[PDB]
């Protein structure tokens, strides 16, 4: 509820949409994040296992990241867990975008 924000990403994980609830949780305005890779915000120590998770994402269709730190606009990092779901084009069944349910645990 109060700890959650939705996002949408292109297949390279750049933000194509972000829930306004993120502002209260991490300080960013959604417009700030549009077009930027979420990898720019992951803590360096979490990048590798998140890359592995997103690799499996296209094979599995839906994945959960487990816990990672994400850089907030101010105040340092927040702990997050994300469930990512691939949305497919009907005609060619090719991946279209990624929808993420992000929840803060710190």
């Amino acid at each position: 509820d109060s700890k959650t924000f939705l996002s949408e990403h292109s297949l390279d994980m750049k933000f194509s949409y972000c829930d306004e609830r993120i502002t209260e949780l991490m300080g960013y305005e959604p417009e700030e994040l549009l077009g930027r890779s979420i990898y720019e915000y992951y803590h360096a120590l979490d990048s590798d296992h998140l890359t592995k998770t997103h690799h499996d994402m296209f094979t599995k269709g839906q994945v959960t990241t487990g816990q990672y730190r994400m850089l907030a606009k101010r105040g340092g990092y927040v702990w997050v867990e994300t469930q990512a779901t691939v949305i497919y084009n009907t005609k060619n069944s090719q991946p279209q975008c990624i929808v993420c349910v992000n929840y803060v645990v710190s």
Binding site: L6, E8, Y17, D19, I87, Y88, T90, Y103
Partner: protein, 111 residues
């Protein structure tokens, strides 16, 4: 260089009521978010498709988190009945037992 399909995300309770609407709904179906919130998506659905849409709510709940897609006609603000493909799945925060809700990605597609 890439023409992207027009789409928006919404959240619904199991009954079909909009409980969240992403602002791209304006471009997609013509309505402001406040004009959809609190209303059942079935209200905007073509009569031929309404039961198919109702059934989709029930089915997506039984998929327990997996994605279901359905095609239906949605009455836009300007009264054009747009072909929409909605891919939906339920979510429940793993740390609690709040009732599942449905996340929908709604795209205006050719049919």
């Amino acid at each position: 260089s890439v023409c992207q399909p027009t789409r928006f995300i919404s959240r619904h309770n199991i009954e079909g009521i909009f409980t969240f609407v992403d602002h791209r709904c304006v471009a997609t179906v013509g309505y402001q978010p406040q004009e959809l919130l609190g209303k059942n998506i079935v209200e905007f659905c073509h009569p031929e498709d309404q039961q198919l849409l109702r059934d989709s709510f029930q089915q997506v709940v039984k998929l327990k988190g997996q994605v279901l897609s359905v095609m239906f006609r949605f009455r836009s603000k300007n009264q054009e009945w747009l072909w929409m493909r909605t891919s939906s799945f339920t979510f429940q925060n793993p740390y609690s037992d709040e009732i599942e809700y449905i996340i929908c990605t709604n795209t205006n597609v050719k049919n």
